[PDB]
Design a protein around this nucleic acid. Structure first.
Ligand SMILES: NC[C@@H]1O[C@H](O[C@H]2[C@@H](O)[C@H](O[C@@H]3[C@@H](O)[C@H](N)C[C@H](N)[C@H]3O[C@H]3O[C@H](CN)[C@@H](O)[C@H](O)[C@H]3N)O[C@@H]2CO)[C@H](N)[C@@H](O)[C@@H]1O
Lengths: 272, 49
RNA sequence: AGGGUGAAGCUGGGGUGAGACCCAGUGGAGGCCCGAACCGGUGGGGGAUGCAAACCCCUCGGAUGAGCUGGGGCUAGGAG
RNA sequence: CAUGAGUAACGAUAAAGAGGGUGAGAAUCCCUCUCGCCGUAAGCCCAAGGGUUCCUACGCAAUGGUCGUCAGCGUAGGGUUAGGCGGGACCUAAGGUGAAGCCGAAAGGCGUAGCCGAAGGGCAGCCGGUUAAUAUUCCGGCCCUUCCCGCAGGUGCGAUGGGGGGACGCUCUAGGCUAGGGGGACCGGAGCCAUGGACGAGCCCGGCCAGAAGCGCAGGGUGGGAGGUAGGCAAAUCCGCCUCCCAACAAGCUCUGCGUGGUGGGGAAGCCCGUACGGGUGACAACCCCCCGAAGCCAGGGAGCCAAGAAAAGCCUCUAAGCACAACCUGCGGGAACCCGUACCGCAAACCGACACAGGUGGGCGGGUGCAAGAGCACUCAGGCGCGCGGGAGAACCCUCGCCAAGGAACUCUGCAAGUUGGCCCCGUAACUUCGGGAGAAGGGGUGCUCCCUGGGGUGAUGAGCCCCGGGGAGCCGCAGUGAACAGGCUCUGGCGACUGUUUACCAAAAACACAGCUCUCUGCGAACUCGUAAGAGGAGGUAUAGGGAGCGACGCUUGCCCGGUGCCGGAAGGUCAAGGGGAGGGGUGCAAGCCCCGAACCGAAGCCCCGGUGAACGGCGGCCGUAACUAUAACGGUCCUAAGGUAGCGAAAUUCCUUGUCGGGUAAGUUCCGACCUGCACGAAAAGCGUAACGACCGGAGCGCUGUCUCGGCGAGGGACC
């Protein structure tokens, strides 16, 4: 029920460089799931470019485990949703009920794993940080206990356990930074399920992108009647500005944001 | 040649009606205004069927 | 409406260790290719108080996709 | 109220001519007879929307673009009725409302819940007959629907709260049934040879449609238990988790074919009569046989592929609590069932454009012949017409369309146009290439119809039952054999751009913008922005492979020189200043304690200065002078200047004004383009630079082909012009 990434159509005219992926569980989801409105327009004013749609399923997923902190679960199997950067495992809880959950590193259908008060540090179970075997990996992870799985490292194979101090453990998050969460808080054990996805290649843009749902963006689009920047000519403007009365693209946003100093440091950057 | 007309028993009837006018304050207001300021009636009455 | 194209998988036959990979049959995917209904509307032509407050003709592009379309709705006018 | 004007014009070049009729008058009404155009629509059909009108009877002074005894016109009267069609008496999404709640100077903003709110859900009938007129609504035949009263048999019955459940892409697609095509000389029938012929498997007409369920084709939708039954999906045997047996092409329970009760219809002519709307009409039928079949139906299939496809009845399943003695499941009898709806127009003179405007406007085969296939083609079936002003000769000339020869672009800014050319089958097919392809390259050749020998996929084996090519052979007639209508002109080459596209409704088919894919860079989610007066939503039930700002824009090679100024990014040591904290001190009034000012030594926020950082960040990347045996530049030869001073490729280009630059090619000649050169008036990598196949209604340069296009064209047909 894993999934092929690479399959690429071939020379079926410019449908060139189209990357397929196929989870093998292929089953159509199950019983627990509604749908999302057609947002893009919202609070009934309209906003943010692109946006279009394309077919309609729509998710409900588990984001909180302490709610059975124990009932082993066995991979119902693999599958996913018209959302999320890295598929899911519909899991079965030994008590009858099941739940759509993450999809860490390639686990295995039928596999038993669970979590709570002491779970075996086997990628799959989840645990209050504290049970953090420092130097290990998780994601999903949530600071401010109860505030549900906060930091759903999307396909975000990224929760790197980095030491502890006080009632907070240190973590290396996607981004390339290190924050802190009080141990009692929690983490889904292990890592994500998708990345190659991230590399996926798609053919005739219009076709693909739109299918994605998203349409466009078109800067200093000539007639700068608005389009912040210049136009009514070839030449790329100067000032150094962006759409809807913008600050270019090299300035802050944070602030006192009591948030900030409160934890984390590394400051915002990487260097591949 | 989509000369924009082509009404809809529904749509038009719909969009506009006594109710509706009384709903929006502007609706109501204009209502009375016209109504007794100069007689007539109310197209939101104009309706058919 | 209709017609051609002819990938991937597979099945078998072919060559190493197995394998690559080949050939053949199957197949019959979106791009699509050809071309009506459908949707656009140059290229030339025909009206100037014209069938018409934007037309008729000969013609031409897409002709499963960011396609076309009836019904039901929300955003609106220094706002969309 | 005049004026061109009694000229321009009548709404489509889909033609009409006759006879009789009725009339005060009939090109322009009625019948009937010749005749053309639709037919895939000028068909019918549902729906929308119109809302009179529809009919029947009188009438025409207004109205139709004149007519007019015609009407959709005027006057009057009559005309659509349904437990089972539809919609509500039910369900719900988006979506509006909104008891709560959060929120505004006010008016309101936001809003769960419950509600309103759909040809999206769900639900019980069909066919034959009857009116001037409406119909599965009426009549009749046939088939049911729930709800109420009862009774008869049967049960833990008994919410709508838990659950299971109805529920769902797209592409495609096996198997199975009517629709629905089609030949039956196959049976019924009213007739015929007119004309050289044939009365002969001749023509012409028809040879069904509905039918409880009973039943026979297809399939169409799965598990029996038991127990554990640490979830339950709060409340309990119903689901789901674990386990041991039976888990059978299993019995299961939901549409077709026959049924057949059985009813009903049943058409040609034909000729009798009404204007017609019509009717008798032949027994009145014969109503059987064989062929082809779908995107329809069974069916929620079945495969494959992602971009991975809605919420309320029904079956159960327990409280409430009644039930359980009168609750539910189930037969028979009895009795009930209301509200709003049809007329007709309705791809269009009744719906939308102010007009009987040739514009537009949603789904239902779309009869037949032929064509390889087919709603395109040509002629037609039914069914629909004949556009509503007429007759007339027919000269100018615009229109529409036809033919040419001699030459075949010189016309011309442009081969604008138009002609060439085009239907399938076989021979065959270039530089280049992302080896997908450019190929319908390109260039040939073919087909018609006869008779003859020869193989095939159909259908109950398979034998008048059909579709595929056969294959080949001899031969037949035309200038001619996709014989008419559907139907590529072509090749070479260059700039741009990738290619699919959207737009510019009102010139600007097409670059621009898309874009896939590049890089910078922004944000830690109560992210960052976008609207908002808070409230709040949005964002994202997403959660830095993620969500934003951006210049570019497949891909290939490749992105170098400066951050001294500008913005932005980093550090407040220091200089620097608002309010403030503030007190030295001066001050007016104070007989006086006092009351009150001004007040400024010092501390004092970002910012600003200052110091680094900094281009896929604004934005820029030079000037001059000298030297290698001689005659020509090239190397630094040091200097003036600044932040350095433009690399790689590139060049007279969608940037060279001197320019029709100079050479070269093309050419009788060419400021045109292709190639060179390169002293680049004023290219350069990121608003990309050089290149780069495929693809353009791209724009430009060749050349073969063809053609009243050009040397003038010349006659010709159809329409106005003209009487
Ligand atoms: N290594 C240098 C190589 O040669 C050139 O260098 C250039 C550059 O460096 C240098 O530029 C310098 C700059 O001070 C400024 N532009 C003024 C100065 N006159 C100039 O120098 C010039 O004049 C010099 C004295 N009369 C001579 O050495 C020579 O003619 C020339 N270099 O001069 C060269 C030409 O402008 C190429 N540009 C480069 O690509 C290549 O690598």
């Amino acid at each position: 029920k894993f999934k092929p990434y690479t399959p690429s159509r071939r020379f079926m005219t410019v449908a060139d460089f189209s990357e397929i992926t196929k989870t093998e569980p292929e089953k159509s989801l199950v019983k627990p799931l509604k749908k999302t409105g057609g947002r893009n327009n919202q609070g009934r004013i309209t906003v943010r470019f692109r946006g279009g749609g394309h077919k309609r399923l729509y998710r409900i997923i588990d984001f909180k485990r302490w709610d059975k902190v124990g009932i082993p679960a066995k991979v119902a199997a693999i599958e996913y949703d018209p959302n999320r950067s890295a598929r899911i495992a519909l899991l079965h809880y030994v008590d009858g009920e099941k739940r759509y959950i993450i999809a860490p590193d390639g686990l295995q259908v039928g596999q038993q794993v669970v979590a709570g008060p002491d779970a075996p540090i086997q990628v799959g179970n989840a645990l209050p940080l504290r049970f953090i075997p420092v130097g290990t990996v998780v994601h999903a992870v949530e600071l401010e206990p109860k505030k549900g799985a906060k930091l759903a490292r999307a396909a975000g194979t990224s929760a790197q356990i980095q030491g502890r101090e006080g009632d907070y453990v240190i973590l290396r998050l996607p981004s390339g930074e290190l924050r802190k969460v009080h141990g009692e808080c929690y983490a889904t054990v292990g890592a994500v399920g998708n990345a190659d996805h991230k590399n996926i290649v798609l053919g005739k843009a219009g076709r693909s992108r739109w299918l994605g749902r998203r349409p466009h963006v078109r800067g200093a689009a000539m007639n700068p009647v608005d389009h912040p920047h210049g136009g009514g000519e070839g030449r790329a403007p100067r000032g150094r500005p962006p759409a809807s009365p913008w600050g270019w693209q090299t300035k802050g946003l944070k602030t006192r944001k009591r948030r900030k100093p409160s934890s984390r440091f590394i400051i915002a950057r990487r260097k591949k | 040649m989509k000369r924009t007309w082509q009404p809809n028993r529904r749509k038009r009837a719909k969009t506009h009606g006594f109710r509706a006018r009384m709903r929006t304050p502007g609706g109501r207001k204009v209502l009375k205004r016209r109504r007794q300021k100069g007689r007539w009636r109310l197209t939101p009455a104009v309706r058919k069927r």
